[PDB]
């Protein structure tokens, strides 16, 4: 019964986030949602209070217990580099790197491929990424497609193109 | 300009909800989210917790303050009928009737058209509705279409067909 660690940044795009969670719940895939935050209480881009399962600090060292990582992008991302030293963002890099190195399935949209890329795990792999974050892809092969599936990477250009890969994401977890 | 009252049942389908909220937010359309519940704190079908703006009881008497109602469906709706002693479900019927009677734009998906139908406001209008809820449509005219726009009614069969009518909804609310 497959298990996914869903990473929700703060603020998270709720439309992206619930596309994933709704598809997992409807298809009987297990998930736990970790805030990329000090607290499990976060906000959506649109300002709604959202309380998820746990915080990313508590995912570290437990990466083994999951089959897949979802990076659910949001308005936190454009300020990531500015706040790279925040503990939740140091944990973010380590966890993405660990999942990547352990061969887990890596799922993301908008700037998710960029977060993956920063850790080097995307080396030589086709990724779809927000057209704005395309210049920051240094290790992966950034394309202009709505989504790219390559090896362990499942990435969509943004929330409005998650649909183009989601049936395949679900099938790979079922 | 235009103001939308969004009704979130408990549990709500978060994929449906945020498709609306992201679209409104990104197009600068004003909205306020009301829990169809005894408190502002609701769950998603997927088990996340949302704290919304207010409860539906506080929308009673203020329907003319809004231009549009969104009914955001969830796994609460198929138990709606069992739960006649929840005051917020009685309030729901009241609020939907009042909005429809006052000629407001009525927007919803999945079993939303059925909630509308129960109040009678759908008399003679085409609606899109989830297949399982279709036989419950007696006042309106249920179709097999992905979405239906008829008069003041903008309804989608479910969360995965919202995209088919959402640009028209946005255009109408500008
Ligand atoms: C035929 C086709 C199918 C689509 N299916 C979905 C869908 O299931 N869910 C969704 O959010 N968007 C879907 N889109 C809508 C796109 O998000 C939209 O056209 C752009 O924003 C679809 C678009 C086309 C090309
Ligand atoms: Ca949002
Ligand atoms: Ca949900
Ligand atoms: Zn993003
Ligand atoms: Zn429903």
Curated annotation (Swiss-Prot), chains A, B:
Coiled coil: none annotated. GO terms for cellular component: cytoplasm. InterPro entries: Class_I_gatase-like, DJ-1/PfpI, Prot/Nucl_acid_deglycase. One of its GO terms (molecular function) is nucleotide binding. Zn(2+) binds at residues 73, 110. It holds the Pfam family DJ-1_PfpI. Keywords: Flavoprotein, FMN, Metal-binding, Nucleotide-binding, Zinc. The keyword Transport does not apply. Riboflavin binds at residues 160, 163. The keyword Transport does not apply. Binds flavin derivatives, such as lumichrome, riboflavin, FMN, and FAD. May act as a flavin storage protein. Appears to lack proteolytic or chaperone activities. PANTHER family: PARKINSON DISEASE PROTEIN 7 HOMOLOG, PROTEIN/NUCLEIC ACID DEGLYCASE DJ-1-RELATED. Homodimer. This is Protein ppBat. It comes from Bacteroides thetaiotaomicron (strain ATCC 29148 / DSM 2079 / JCM 5827 / CCUG 10774 / NCTC 10582 / VPI-5482 / E50).
């Amino acid at each position: 019964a497959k298990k996914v660690a869903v990473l929700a940044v703060n603020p998270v795009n709720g439309c992206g986030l619930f596309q994933y969670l709704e598809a997992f719940f409807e298809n009987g895939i297990s998930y736990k949602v970790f805030a990329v935050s000090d607290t499990k209480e976060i906000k959506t881009n649109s300002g709604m209070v959202l309380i998820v399962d746990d915080v990313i600090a508590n995912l570290k060292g437990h990466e083994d217990e999951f089959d897949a990582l979802v990076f659910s992008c949001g308005d936190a991302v454009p300020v990531f580099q500015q706040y790279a030293n925040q503990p939740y963002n140091v944990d973010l890099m380590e966890v993405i790197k660990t999942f990547g190195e352990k061969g887990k399935m890596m799922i993301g949209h908008c700037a998710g491929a960029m977060m993956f890329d920063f850790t080097g795990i995307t080396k030589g792999k086709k990724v779809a990424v927000h057209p704005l974050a395309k210049p920051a892809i240094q290790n992966g092969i950034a394309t202009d497609e709505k989504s790219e599936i390559d090896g362990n990477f499942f990435t969509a250009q943004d929330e409005n193109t998650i649909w183009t890969m989601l049936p395949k994401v679900i099938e790979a977890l079922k």
